[PDB]
């Protein structure tokens, strides 16, 4: 028999850890709030610590060492093809090794 009220909606997806997937590299970075949309999803305590210190400077960079070059270009051409201001940070700083040097 068929009936209405049983599907399920889609979902934006709360993860994260898509950049080491392989595949799915536009979707992610392509929906709206892919960089400050996990913080609102639970949104909880003030201000998100555990591995990072503040002393005087704070940088983890993993996207130059064991990355070629295509793939890093890939990921700030698709940052700043929709325009995030949430992940505008992200985007341009890893395009930041291109103009600024």
Same mark, same amino acid.
Do not use: C
């Given at each position: 028999?068929? #009936? ?6 889609? *979902? ?9 997937? #392989?595949?799915? =590299?536009?979707?992610? $970075?392509?929906?709206? #709030? =892919?960089?400050?949309? =996990?913080?609102?999803?639970?949104? *909880?305590? !003030? ?11 704070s940088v983890?960079? $993993? *996207?130059?060492?064991? $990355?070629? #070059?295509?793939? =890093? ?5 698709? *940052?700043? +093809?929709?325009?995030? !201001? ?5 985007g341009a700083?890893? +395009?930041?090794?291109?103009? +600024?040097?």
């Open positions: 028999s068929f #009936g209405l009220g049983k599907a399920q909606d889609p *979902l934006d997806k709360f993860f994260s850890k898509i950049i080491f997937s #392989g595949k799915p =590299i536009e979707t992610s $970075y392509s929906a709206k #709030g =892919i960089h400050e949309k =996990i913080i609102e999803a639970h949104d *909880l305590h !003030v201000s998100k610590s555990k591995n990072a210190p503040i002393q005087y400077a983890m960079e $993993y *996207l130059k060492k064991t $990355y070629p #070059g295509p793939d =890093i270009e890939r990921i700030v051409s698709t *940052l700043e +093809r929709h325009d995030e !201001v949430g992940a505008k940070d992200l700083k890893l +395009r930041d090794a291109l103009d +600024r040097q």
